[PDB]
Amino acid sequence: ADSVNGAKIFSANCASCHAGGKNLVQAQKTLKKADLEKYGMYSAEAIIAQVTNGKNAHPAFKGRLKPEQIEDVAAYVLGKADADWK
Numbered sequence: 001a002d003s004v005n006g007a008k009i010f011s012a013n014c015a016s017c018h019a020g021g022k023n024l025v026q027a028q029k030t031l032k033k034a035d036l037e038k039y040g041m042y043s044a045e046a047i048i049a050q051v052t053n054g055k056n057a058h059p060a061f062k063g064r065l066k067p068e069q070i071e072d073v074a075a076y077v078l079g080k081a082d083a084d085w086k
């Protein structure tokens, strides 16, 4: 997958709710590494799944994003989390 492209996908599709790796509307569930771990989301497969089909009422992106773009934003998210969202 492509982290750098994922940044772009993230800015257009995720950052409204997850700016800075945070969660503007549900502060308990951010994209920081510790919160991803807590919720069993610290993996590309988990993130892809969440974003694709959107369960837990999460926005679903299958309609508007290609698989490859979903893979890309997931790798982006994991990279950022590892870097503590800079």
Ligand code: HEC
Pocket (backbone or CB within 6 Å): 010, 013, 014, 015, 016, 017, 018, 023, 025, 026, 028, 029, 030, 031, 032, 035, 036, 039, 041, 047, 050, 051, 055, 056, 057, 058, 059, 061, 073, 074, 077
């Ligand atoms: C609001 C309109 C959102 C947009 C757009 C996206 N996300 Fe989101 N995300 C949102 C909420 C309200 C929650 C918490 C409830 C839940 O379903 O988990 C989340 C959570 C996530 C998580 C899990 C974070 C954690 O458990 O700590 C991930 C990994 C996630 N969101 C990823 C993500 C991505 C990649 C997005 C764009 C493609 C995206 N979200 C958009 C709300 C909203």
